[PDB]
Every structure is written in C-alpha cells, then in structure tokens.
Design a protein around this ligand. Structure first.
Ligand SMILES: Nc1ncnc2c1ncn2[C@@H]1O[C@H](COP(=O)(O)OP(=O)(O)OP(=O)(O)O)[C@@H](O)[C@H]1O
Ligand SMILES: Nc1ncnc2c1ncn2[C@@H]1O[C@H](COP(=O)(O)OP(=O)(O)OP(=O)(O)O)[C@@H](O)[C@H]1O
Ligand SMILES: CN1[C@@H](CSCC(F)(F)F)Nc2cc(Cl)c(S(N)(=O)=O)cc2S1(=O)=O
Ligand SMILES: CN1[C@@H](CSCC(F)(F)F)Nc2cc(Cl)c(S(N)(=O)=O)cc2S1(=O)=O
Ligand code: NA
Ligand code: NA
Lengths: 847, 847, 29
C-alpha cells in the first residue's frame, strides 16, 4: 500500500506533451501558415523552440545533482540559488499556474459555447455561458485532483489518446479525394503548384506581420516544466526528467512542423464556398490555380470579400478532416489537460514553499493529508483563485501579465545553471553532461529581451513584483542553510582577491595599522573591541585573539561550536573582526603562537593591543613576569604595542549586547597627546585616524612635546605646547606612594655582587636589587613626575595618549617596569592609551 | 585668505526660490487655469508639490547626518548601495544639470529674439539668432560664475529683486479698473460671477486633459536640490538646509496658488480683441457673460475664432499688469537665475566626481585651479556640454529624456534613505524630527511611477543608460579585506566543502614535486599554504628574514603557483608544525589537510627523528586534520636561470589512477583524485577503484559499490574486488619485513607493562614483545596488500592507498613507520596515502 | 565502536551503523 510512483513515459513525457499542446494547433497554426508561408512559419517554430530547448537542458542539468524531492521547480531553483532568489519566484510560479487554470478553462468554455449556440438554444447571453460552463468544469477538475494522484494519470492518458485520434482523423482526411462541399471551400488534396505558390509570405490585415505571428505562436511552445513539477511522485527523477522533458520537446516540435507543411500543400488561400462557382467554358480567362482544378474564385479574390480558405476561415482544419467532431474532441482534450496540469502543479509547488517558512501567515496551506500527504488545502486555494478569474471572463489583457510571470521563471532556471557552473564548487557534479555554460547565459538574457519585446508594460509588473518579494526576504534573513552556489561564490571571490595580493611587493607607501587584539572571549571585555574597531574599520585588519589555558591540546569538534558562537557575537555588533583561538599551557606562549603564525600572506598583524593588569598587586608575582614578557616578545617580533587602561576595568564578566563608551558621541572635549619619543609615528597616527570619524570629529587634539616637524605630515594638528618641567622632585607624598608600592618586590641585600644577587634572584626573577634601584632613579622620578602634569592638563579630557616606556632587558626587572606602567596612569577620568611604535616611518603618507 | 560662507536665507532659500521659479509661472498658469479651472489646478499643484516635499524631507534628513563637501548628493547612494550606482547616478545628475543650462539659455534667447524682431529688424535667420544669443549669454554666465562665489550670489539676488517687482506690478495692475482697450481683450476687475464661472474645467484642444496639464506643470516644480549642492560653502549645513529647502517649497507653492486663483477671478476665457463691439439694445440677445459689462463676444463664442482671452492668448499677464515691460524683465530674471543655478550645481558635482577616489571613470579630465578653490575644471566641462546642446538647438525631443534623469536621481535618493534605515546600517543615524522611512519609500515608488506615466519611451532610455554605465565600471588590499570579512556571514555546508592544504615543503625550491602536485587540484579551487620551519633558538625577527620570505614568494610567483608562504621559528620541527596548524589562516580560510613527504632515510637516521616524524601525524590527527603522505622512488628533495621540471608538469596521457579504497574515511581519498582529474593533464586518465570483500559475495558487493559510487556522481570507470586480502604473504617477504623491524625490537622476554616502561622511558620508539605478537595479523595484512598493489598497479600514473592509523600508545613509532614503508616500496609511480578525519565530504542530497 | 569500517552505504544516508569517530580509533583506551 505504498504510494504509487511513476515511470518516465507516464510521469514526465506524457504530461509535458499534453501541456505543450494547446489550441494553436487547431485554430491558429493554419492561419499562421497562410500569412507567413511555410518557410517563415518553420523559422518561427525553430526560433521559438530554441529558447525552450535551452531551458530544458538547464533544468535537466540542475535536477541531476543530488536527490530531488516533493517540491517541483521551486525546489530545484531554491536549492541551487538560495532562499532569496528561489523564494521570490516560487511564489509567482504558483500564482501564475493558478491563473493559467482559469485561462485554460475559459478556452474550453468558449468552444462549448460555440458548439451549443449553433445547434440549439443557449442558456443565457454569450458571456454568462462562459461563466456557468467554466465554473462547472473547473469543479470536476478539482474533484479529479482531490480523488488521488492515480486518477489524474488516467485522465491524462485518456486526453492523450483523444489527441492522437484527432491527429489520425485529420491526416486520414487530407488524403481522400475532395468532395464538392470541400473543393468549393478550397481543399484540393496535395498538389505541387499549390505547395510552391504557398512557400512565400502573403501578409494581409492589421496583425499580419512577422512579429505579429511570433507573438501569437511563442507562448504556445512553452509550459515544458509540468512533469518536473511532480518530482515527489517519480521513481528516479535524476533519470526520468532529462529524458521526458527533451523528448516531449522534440516530438511536439515534429508535430508543429508537420501540421503546417501538410495543411499548406492542400488548401488555397482564397476561396468562396459557393457550389455554383464551378468554371464555365468560354468565360474568357479566369484567376488563380483553382482554375486548373475547375473552380472559379475571380470575383472573390478581386473584390476582397470571400469567407473561406486558409487565410480567411479559422476552422479549415475541421473541414479537411474525415469527420469533424473528432477535431472538437481533440480541442477539448488539449485544453482540459493543460488546465489539470496547471492545477496540480500550483498546489505541489505551494506546499513546498509553505513548509520552508520564508513568508508570513501562509503556513496553513502546507499541511499534508492522508498517506501521500497531498495538499488538500492548496487545491482549494488554487480553486478559489481560478474561479475568481473565471468570473471575470475577459482575460485578453490579463494574459500578457501571466505569460511574463513564466518567462521570468525561464530566466532564473537558466541563471541557476550558469551560476552553478561558473562557480564550480567542489560538490557540483551533475550526471547530465550535455549542457553548456554560455548557452545557459544566452538563454537568461534572451528570456528578458523577449519579455520586453512581447509587452513593455507587463515586464515591468513582473520585475517589480520579483524585486518586492526578493527584498522582503533579504531584509528578513530567514535562517535556512541549503548548500547554494551563492554561498560558494563568496569563498571563490575571497580567495581570488586574497591571492592577488601576492603579486605586489612590500613598499613604504602602503603602511597600514594591522592589529592583533587580546580580548579573550570577545564579550568579556567589549571595550577593546569597540576602541579598536573604531579606527581600523574599512582600513586594515583586526584579529581578536584568545588563549585557552590548559594542559590538553585536542580540537574536539565542540571547540568549533564555541568559536562559531563567538564569531556571531561580532557579526551582530557589526564589528568587522576575525576571531582566532589557540591552545597553550600559559598565556605568554599562546600569544607567541598567535603572533608567529596568524594572518595570510601579506595581510598579517603588526600591532599588539592588550589591556591592563588591574590586579597586579594581588595576583601571584609569577603572573607579572609573563605579562611583561608578552610586551618584550612583541618588541622582539618587531611589533608595536598599545596598553589600554580604564578606571573601572575592562572585564565585564566579573541575550542583549552590552554598551560601552566608545559607541557614543564624545562632544567638544579634547584628545591630549604627550609626544615624548620619535617612535616613528604610531603615537600620532592612532589619534589622527580615530578623531577623523564622526564621533570624534568635534574634538580638538593637542599634541605636547618634551613646529615644522608636525607640519610636513599634514596631520591637521591643532595645538602644540612645551611641557613645563619634566625633571624635578615632585611632592614627597607622591614619592613615598611610589616607594611603598614597590617595597614588597625588594630584595634588601644592601649592596652585593651582581652574581651573588642572581644566586637568589634565580628562583624569583622579579625581585629588585638595591643596585638596580640606585642606577635607575632619574627615570623613575620622571615617571612619577609626569603623572602630576597629566593630572593638571587633562583632568576632563575624553582620551589621553602617552608614550610607552621601555625597560632595559636584564637591567630592569619585571616588577619595577610594571610599577612604571602603573604610575604613569593612576587616578585619571578618561581612557588612557600607552603607545610605542617600532621605529618605522609610518606617517610617510596620509594613513 | 578667509573662505566665504553664506547664511540660510541667502544660501539655501533664495537659491531654491530662483531654481523653482520658471517661465511656467508667467506663460502657462493662466492657460492651465482657463483650461482646467481653479479647483482642479489647485489639485494639480498640491499633487505635484507632495512629491517634492517628501524628497525634501529625505534630502534634509541626509544633511543632518554628518558633514559633506559640495556635490556629495550621491555620496549616500554610494554608501548604501555601493560605489557603482552612486558614481553613475552622480555622473547622470551632473550631466542633466549641464543640459538644463542649455535649455534655460535657449528659452531666454527665444524671448530676447522675439522682443528684438519687434522694435527693430532681425540681422540674421531666426534659428541662428538663437545660436548667437545663447552662446553669448552662457559665456557671460560662465564669466560671472568663474570669478568667485560672492559675485554669483549678488547676481542671484538682483534676479530675486527683478522677480519680486514683477509680482507687485501684476498685482497692482489687477486692481485698476479696465481701460477701453484692456476690457476689449477680456480683463475686468475682481468680480464674483467670473470666479463662479471659472471654478469648473473647460477642456478644449488636443491637450485638454487633466494629465495633459500635469505633464506640463510637474517638471516645473522640481529644483529643490540647488541649496544642497553647495553644502560645503554653508555656514551651518545641519540647520540651514532643512529650513531653507523646506521654506522655499512652501513659499513658491503659495505664489502658484495665489496667481492661479487671482487671475481666475479676473479675465474671461475668450474675447474678440476689437474695439467696435459696443453693445446697443435691439439686435437679439447677448450670448455670453461679458455682455453684462457692455461687450458683445458672440462672434468668437459660436465660431471658435478669437485670438484673445484666457484660453487663447498666452501673454495675458503682459496686459493684465499695470505695465508690460516689467513682466518681460521678470521673465529674463526667471530664466537666467535657473541657468546660473544649474551651472554651479553641475560644476560642484563634476569636481566632486573628479576628486573621488572610488570612481576613476572621469578622474582624468584636467588640472584645476584651487588657488581660489574654484572648480575650474568642473566649470569648463559644464560650459562645453551647455554650448554643444545650445548649438544643436534640438530641444523638445530631448526634454523628456533629461526630465527622467532627475527622477531616477530622486527615486534612488529616497530608496537609499529607506535601505540604510531598514538595514540598521552602522553610520546612518540622522537627527531630523520629521523623517520616516515609509515616506521615503513612497517617494521612491512614486518617482518611478511618474517616469513611466509622463513619457514611457524616455524612461526606458534613462534606465538603460544607468545600466550601461553601471555594468561598464564593474567589468588590491581593500578588496582582499572586504571579501574576507564577507565570508564571516556565510555558513558551512557539506556541498561547499573545499580541501584546504598545509604543505610542509621547507624551502619551496628543495622539493618542487610537492608544490607541483598540490597546486594542481587546489588551483582556482581552495587555499594552499607552503609551510617552513626554521630550527634555531629564540631568534630575532630580522630584516633579512623578511628578505628571504620575499625571495621565496618571488620564486613561487615565477613558477605561477597560486599559493601562500609562511615560516615560523621553533626549537625543533614538530613544535613549529604545531604552531602552523594552530594559528595559520584567516577566518574561514584555514587549512584542514596536512601534506607531508616521505621520511626516505628512516632506516639509517637517528631513531629519535622517526619519533618526531610520527608525532607530526599524531598531532595532525589530534587537531582533526586529514593527512596525505607522498612518496617517489628517487626522493622528493632535489637539492641533493631555469627552474627544475617535475613529472607533474606534463600531460599524463592514457594511464590510470588506482584508488585502493580500503577503509571509510568520509570520502577524501575519493575526492582528491576526482579534483585531480578535473584538470587538463589528468582528464584522459582512466580511474579504477579497488575494494576489499569476501569471495562468496563478489557480485553482491561489486554491484553495491558501483551503486554507491553512482550516487556520488564521481564518474569512476571500473570497480574491482579483492577477495585474497587475508592470506599469508610469501615467506621471503615476511622475512624482509621482520629483518627491518629488528634494530627497533626490545627483546624483553614477556614482562608486565611496568617492566617494559622501565627500559622504554629513555627510548620510547622500541617495540615490546607483546606489541610484536598482538600486531602480527595487522602487519602481515600490509605485507600482502603491498603484493596486491604491485600486482595490479605496475604502470599507473598515480596510486592512492588509504592510510592506516595506529592507536596512540599501542603502536610504537617504529612499527607504524614500518607499516608505511611496507605499503609502498618497490613501486615506480607516485604513491599518495590519504586518510580523512572520519567526517563526510560527499553527499547524495541537494538540500 | 572501536575497529575501522569498510566502505558502506549506511554511513552516508540520512534517517544505525555510524562510523567510528577519529577520537575512537586514535585516543588511548
Ligand atoms: N585568556 C586570554 N586570552 C587572551 N587575552 C587575554 C587573556 N587573559 C588576559 N588577556 C589579555 O591580558 C590583559 C590583561 O590581563 P589581565 O588578566 O590582568 O586582564 P583581566 O584582569 O582578565 O581583565 P581586566 O584587565 O579588565 O581586569 C587583558 O585585558 C587581555 O587583553
Ligand atoms: N624544515 C621543514 N619544514 C617543513 N617541513 C619539513 C621540513 N623538513 C622536512 N619537512 C617535511 O618532512 C618530510 C620528510 O623530511 P626528511 O627529513 O625525510 O627530508 P626529505 O629530504 O624529504 O627526505 P630524506 O631526508 O629522508 O631524504 C619532508 O618531505 C617534508 O615534507
Ligand atoms: C500554456 N502555458 C504557457 C503560457 S500561455 C499564456 C497563459 F495563458 F498561460 F497566461 N506557459 C506555461 C509554462 C509552464 Cl512552465 C507551465 S507549468 N504547469 O509547467 O509550470 C504552464 C504554462 S501555461 O500552461 O500557462
Ligand atoms: C526645471 N528643472 C527640472 C527639469 S525640467 C527641464 C528639463 F530639464 F527637463 F529639460 N528638474 C531639475 C532638478 C534639479 Cl535637482 C535641479 S538642481 N539645479 O537642483 O540640481 C534642476 C532642475 S531643472 O532646473 O533642470
Ligand atoms: Na493541453
Ligand atoms: Na529661475
């Protein structure tokens, strides 16, 4: 009792041929032959099937790259292009099918109306018949659709047999020698003179032009997607869709080519239809080929007023036939089958669009009833939308809008095969190899050129609705991840441009501040993220380091989940930063690994920004040694450093995004820069880049000095000063404050040999000897003295930037250098940044 | 010197006044009022000014968001929608102004010519007099404009005064009681019955339509951006622009309403113009309303043959007014002010474009004289375009094309505001009270509707020129970085898996075979990095080190290998390869495969080096990496002009690729050869897959494997089966294995694990006897599988065997190296030993 | 489990017989 699955004949080919075949076979193809001649009609047919052949190749390539499921064509396009461009146009495909149901039931109601009028009495006026008949027949179609998916197939094969009987009837009729009723109306069976005369065009009327015939034929060679829209009922779609679609195209094209060339070799363009017009001996000389076959249509031809023949009578194909009502049965089948195919297609596509929740308020229609989970709620919606348009009943102006909703799907079926094939992601590997990448682009271009040629003001409606529904999904971010070629183009393009940096040398004219930020977990201290993402956005690189302190190195896959949870926090704050974490047994070695290996070619960090050890007085003195060693390692690797201190600390750990002070307008405060060393120009470059943004543009920056030097860079610097007095004894309380803060790090050895001091300094290298204290007294006094000047001139600034001191390695221990760093920036309101470049010409240009 | 600035009255409001004032105020509002009445002319005016006031709200919300130079009107489009649309729209907006200069100048030349022909004689042809006067006038306007922006701002206040004296002239003329001549043309003073008559439409002529009057008025109400194009010369652009711009619109629309409603109460719609219509009693009755004042106007009213009146005479204001030449003066001012305002706005935008760094299309025009900071080379471009279009003198067929350029600008400005406000862009945050994004979206929709309502074929040329420019400009560091940060939002799917590699290549010119092999399947597909570890104690980053790194990059680029280069410093090789695995890369472009060479001389090297060589693979497996080990007969190292040539640089031909797929590793062992065969040198190579299985299920398993490889779409040719995989090898091959595991054998009897560790702590690479006995079958399997491989794959182009992995702590590093040596010896072709990380890299599905 | 697995169809389907993780064939037991 498993649900029934279909083969390729009964499931794809029959459905596609029934959909393609319409009424233009029976009521307009002979007239097109009469107008344009045989040769130009064949050219119209071939130009028309080129587009739908290229689209068949594209949709055959798409559906042989995986396992196709119960979604139809929306499934293919959306899983090969993405939710934006797939869900924008899976909603107009499903609507255009629902209204094509109505526009194929109207064409059957008109035929029944004509049949009833010319036999007896009609029901009502000749427009409300179109309503009664159409509404009653769309209901039997709905009952067939709801009755199961194995009764739809029986109806389709019945319609197919009816159409083939029609073809046989016509082709038998064109061979019987003509009768009097038929030869008077123009039909003289196959002749060479009536075929040669009828090759050349003979245009007559307002719409008798080449483009006026193309515009009639082309929308009837379309509809090739019907059998691909039941992907969820086929045994193996990856082998059933490419065969069915392409053989349906081939065989319907052969049918179109045979009908025209056969009708145009038997029927003459002008004929009168009066049995008295048989030729009379001695009636001078007459007009036309029909004079040889013994008929006389001179008067008609001349006065231009005869009502029969290939170019005047629309049912020429019904009188050539051996029996007339069989052609009417063929016309019934050719319309009912297309209506049923559209009704099934719309409700299969809409259910899949409603299960993938991209749009609001339409979930209700995705429920599946019964064992095959048929869309019972989608059939009723397509039924309501079809009845609403049947009641309008004059759809001569709504047809161009709908026929352009279907050429906009043709342009995205062809863009899906062009994009997937030029992106070339490992993983796109289709079984169907008989397609091209440039033909699939020509198809996408020409389906829009044709869209505009057919009707300029309906192409606009199509494209406008496509844009509206595209932008809704773009602004909604529906969080679905199906492998898509747009997702695979981002990597292609990132790699393509990143490699291209290798072709450019290292120069002095392209310095950029590329910084490595030691944040730990980014949300534990977002102030660093904000400060650094202010001045480096859209200009250079920014990496957020993180060291996972611990004895086991093993990248179990759990780690990737945490890393992706930290990489989305930075994507939500709209920070343009990378995230990188490493494993090491202590923080110094993790930082050293990040400094050695991170980056990619020429895009690698050259500045190290790190917070400040707020708790260095309480923590075990083994941590201070490694903290200072980090800065020493940065200076050894030829980096530049920045130490950032805030009064309240940076670690906020001790949902919603937290807010810091670097996200807000500063005002008309000042940025104070204490330029004490010609480090190269980083100390002056960080505030110049920072203050040029909107939030800091209303501040004036006042560089101090320990005039023509600052001029040549064109840094736009406001004030220049001279520090009052840097080397004098400060107040005794400040000196004792420095002296007692460092005392718990003192060795108390009087004065001894340096080796002897090292003998007990080996176990604790952070101990300070009295000789080291004595021989670095002036510098310590300078550090304690400059704090008072900073307190004076910068009580109420918005940012203070001071030159960073360097302790002589070996002769300056860790605790004393850390005390210096503590004593240049204690008790200050603003953020304080201590910078020192790496002796490189930085200001050699603007940035 | 001191740069000149302007307030809001003289800098924004006056400019927008004079830009909006046109000839329509003088020559066509009386006609429109007669043709459509008062109450419906008011509707036209209000509907027209709604669009311009919504765009004014948008353009004044942009000005309270930062500060912009002159002509940065497009800078928001290029910030919100990319600097391609922005640049193209800026170029079109400047060109349209440059042509508007020509249109206003010829409109002034027509008036002066028609005045001159009356009071004198025309020296030359009517058409050429236009081409002389227009060129002279544009030259004089350029001379005024190019000589400072203080003189232009004085001329454009003289124009304001001339217009305001004409308003007073007209309004004092309407109050004087009519003269005998003036009443003979239609003028009677303000009176109620004429006002009541004229409240309702009276359509006459081929243009008497509501839309026929809208299409004439609406393009005469735009010009509100004349004050926002000089935001760089304003004193306070965030308070001056929103107020001046929005008050100018109000004060011009009040004037339009006042003039229409005050001339509608004043004249009659038609009048004879002859003085001999004195009315006397006796001749019938009077047919009209003018007879109540003593004038017979029946001669025209029945025959439609009078040349005066409100609906027939275009120059009614010249006679209603108390003095005629002042209205001519008003027209002169109203035209020259518009021409000047269009000439300065074109220069500002062209200069901003030529100075733009993100749009070089037209950045090479000329050298500009910035001594007085004038846009000289933005003035000489507008002057040339204006003079060309004046000489052409074809206008009325180019007016709609250029009226739609401005509406394209309006639509994209409003949509850029909406887009930046809906996507919460970080940097769009205006401070303007009355700004709503839904109004800024209605403005865009309406600006696009009106384009196609006014002239449909000129809105398809305006759009088709934006797309020509946009697609012509689309087709190093700033692109490498903006695309790498864009990868952070895409998620990872199994369909887009890329094999990124870390090649342990040393100096890339000691083993070119490794780089040649790995740069074959990763070319244009995925990341490749050439690692190098410099063994030495802690070493200073040095200038020479970067010189060496540049030399190796140059060598790589000369060979046209598309790879990155990276080197680290470490105490030994293993501890540096860990650094490279942990930190190399950038974001989502980080390696996940490790490629090494074969330790060719492990037999004779110091057995502590094989410990580290195997530890490298152990660490790779610890980090979730895939491993490839490559072997050649003659070794990889070639150190033992022209670059060296390997066998991977030549066409392989018809030989085969043999994949001994023995264990399921997720499919990397199948996906490396597939990508290798996607390239031109390996595309003619047959691929054979050998799998192991039983002897009673040869077919049952062969069909299953063929079915599996067909759902992956890989396209491999044969599938063989190996049933003799568990036999014993030949005796003299087992002996060859066991004599090689001898120097590494512990010979400890059979002791507990503690006793083994006792003598294995110093050397951990030796093999206990228990580990010899428990690894007997696993080892003879390698010995026999080598026999099978050498049996089948004697003359292939590439052999691929799945790599065994030994349990950490149950396989000493000499046993595992012995297995690796056994699997691949005595073979001619290159041998690759792949082993993925047990995660799927291949998929059946598409979702 | 503990021993490596020969190629098989069930490892790639979506719906038992899960291939061992790299930590199960490599980490010390
Ligand atoms: N696990 C880590 N990973 C990366 N960087 C770190 C880590 N721990 C500390 N850092 C860096 O070192 C700086 C100072 O070290 P310290 O441990 O004193 O900071 P903290 O005390 O954690 O936070 P705060 O400085 O706000 O009190 C930190 O601000 C941070 O920049
Ligand atoms: N300095 C290095 N940096 C990175 N990888 C290396 C380095 N030295 C060796 N390797 C990798 O290890 C493999 C084996 O190294 P080995 O010491 O055996 O050198 P070899 O010349 O390749 O072989 P052999 O020394 O046995 O002739 C090499 O092929 C290479 O891939
Ligand atoms: C005959 N049809 C023509 C357009 S004729 C104009 C019209 F009346 F339709 F507006 N195009 C398609 C295309 C497809 Cl692809 C499908 S279908 N069911 O495969 O998806 C159905 C049709 S059609 O039935 O509408
Ligand atoms: C009256 N003008 C109409 C165009 S109607 C005449 C036509 F061009 F169609 F031939 N629109 C605009 C728009 C702007 Cl924005 C500006 S301006 N200086 O602010 O940039 C100037 C003008 S206008 O003065 O040319
Ligand atoms: Na049909
Ligand atoms: Na003007």
């Amino acid at each position: 009792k498993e649900p029934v699955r279909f083969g390729w004949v009964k499931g794809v080919m029959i459905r596609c041929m029934l959909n393609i075949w319409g009424v233009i076979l029976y009521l307009r193809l002979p007239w097109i032959t009469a107008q344009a001649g045989i040769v130009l009609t064949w050219i119209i047919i071939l130009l028309s099937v080129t587009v739908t052949s290229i689209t068949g190749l594209s949709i055959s390539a798409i559906s042989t790259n995986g396992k196709v499921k119960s979604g139809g064509t929306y499934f293919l396009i959306s899983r090969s292009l993405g939710p934006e461009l797939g869900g924008s146009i899976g909603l107009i495909f499903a609507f255009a099918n629902a209204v094509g149901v109505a526009m194929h039931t109207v064409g059957f109601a008109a035929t029944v109306r004509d049949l009833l009028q010319e036999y007896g009495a009609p029901i009502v006026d000749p427009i409300n018949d179109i309503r009664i008949i159409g509404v009653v027949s769309v209901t039997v179609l709905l009952a067939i659709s709801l009755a199961g998916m194995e009764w739809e197939s029986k109806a389709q094969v019945l319609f197919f047999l009816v159409i083939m009987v029609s073809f046989a009837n016509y082709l038998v009729g064109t061979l019987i020698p003509p009768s009097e009723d038929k030869a008077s109306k123009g039909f003289f069976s196959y002749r060479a003179d009536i075929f040669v005369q009828n090759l050349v065009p003979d245009w007559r009327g307002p719409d008798g032009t080449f483009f006026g015939m193309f515009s009639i034929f082309f929308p009837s060679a379309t509809g090739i997607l019907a059998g691909a829209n039941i992907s969820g009922d086929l045994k193996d779609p990856a082998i059933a869709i490419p065969k069915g679609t392409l053989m349906a195209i081939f065989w319907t094209t052969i049918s179109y080519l045979a009908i025209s060339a056969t009708i145009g070799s038997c029927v003459v363009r002008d004929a009168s239809g009066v049995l008295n017009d048989t030729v009379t001996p001695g009636w001078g000389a007459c007009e036309g080929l029909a004079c040889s076959y013994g008929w006389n249509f001179t008067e008609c031809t001349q006065q231009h007023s005869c009502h029969y023949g290939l170019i005047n009578y629309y049912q020429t194909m019904s009188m050539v036939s051996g029996f007339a009502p069989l052609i009417t049965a063929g016309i019934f089948g050719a319309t009912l089958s297309s209506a049923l195919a559209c009704l099934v297609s719309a409700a299969k596509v809409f259910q899949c669009l409603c299960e993938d929740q991209l749009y609001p308020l339409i979930g209700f229609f995705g429920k599946g009833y019964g064992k095959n989970k048929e869309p019972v709620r989608g059939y009723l919606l397509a039924y309501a939308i079809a009845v609403a348009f049947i009641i309008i009943a004059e759809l001569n102006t709504i047809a161009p809008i709908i026929s352009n909703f279907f050429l906009c799907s043709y342009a995205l079926i062809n863009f899906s095969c062009f994009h997937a094939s030029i992106t070339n992601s490992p993983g796109w590997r289709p079984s169907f190899q008989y397609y091209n990448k440039w033909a699939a682009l020509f198809g996408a271009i020409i389906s829009v050129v044709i869209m505009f040629l057919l009707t300029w003001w309906a192409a606009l409606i199509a494209i406008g609705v496509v844009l509206f529904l595209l932008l809704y999904v773009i602004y909604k971010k529906p969080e679905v991840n199906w492998g898509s070629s747009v997702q695979a183009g981002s990597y292609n393009l990132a790699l393509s441009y990143s490699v291209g940096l290798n072709e450019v040398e290292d120069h002095i004219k392209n310095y950029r501040p590329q910084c490595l930020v030691l944040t730990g977990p980014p949300n534990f201290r977002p102030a660093l993220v904000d400060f650094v993402g202010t001045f480096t956005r859209n200009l250079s690189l920014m990496i957020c380091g993180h060291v996972l302190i611990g004895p086991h190195k093993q990248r179990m896959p759990e780690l990737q989940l945490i890393a992706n949870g930290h990489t989305k926090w930075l994507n939500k704050r709209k920070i343009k930063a990378f995230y990188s974490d490493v494993i090491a047994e202590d923080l110094r070695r993790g930082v050293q690994i990040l400094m050695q290996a991170a980056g990619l070619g020429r895009m690698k960090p050259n500045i190290l920004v790190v917070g400040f050890k707020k708790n260095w007085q309480s923590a075990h003195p083994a941590t201070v040694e490694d903290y200072i060693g980090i800065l020493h390692d940065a200076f050894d690797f030829n980096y530049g450093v920045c130490v950032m201190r805030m009064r309240e600390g940076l670690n906020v750990s001790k949902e919603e995004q937290a807010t810091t002070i670097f996200q807000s307008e500063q005002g008309k405060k000042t940025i104070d820069i204490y330029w004490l060393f010609d480090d190269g120009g980083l100390t002056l470059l960080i505030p110049y880049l920072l203050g040029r943004k909107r939030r800091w543009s209303k501040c004036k920056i006042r560089v101090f000095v320990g005039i023509s030097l600052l001029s040549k860079f064109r840094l736009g610097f406001h004030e220049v000063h001279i520090l009052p007095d840097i080397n004098q004894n400060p107040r005794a309380e400040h000196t004792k404050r420095f002296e007692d803060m460092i005392a718990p790090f003192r060795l108390n050895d009087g004065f001894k040999d340096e080796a002897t001091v090292n003998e007990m300094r080996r176990d604790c290298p952070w101990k300070i000897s009295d000789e080291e204290i004595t021989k670095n007294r002036v510098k310590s006094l300078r550090q304690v003295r400059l704090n008072e000047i900073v307190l004076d001139y910068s009580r109420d600034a918005a940012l203070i930037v001071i030159t960073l001191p360097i302790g002589r390695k070996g002769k300056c221990p860790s605790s004393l250098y850390m005390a210096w760093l503590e004593t240049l920036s204690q008790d200050l309101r603003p953020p304080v940044i201590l910078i020192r470049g790496n002796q490189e010409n930085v200001l050699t240009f603007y940035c």
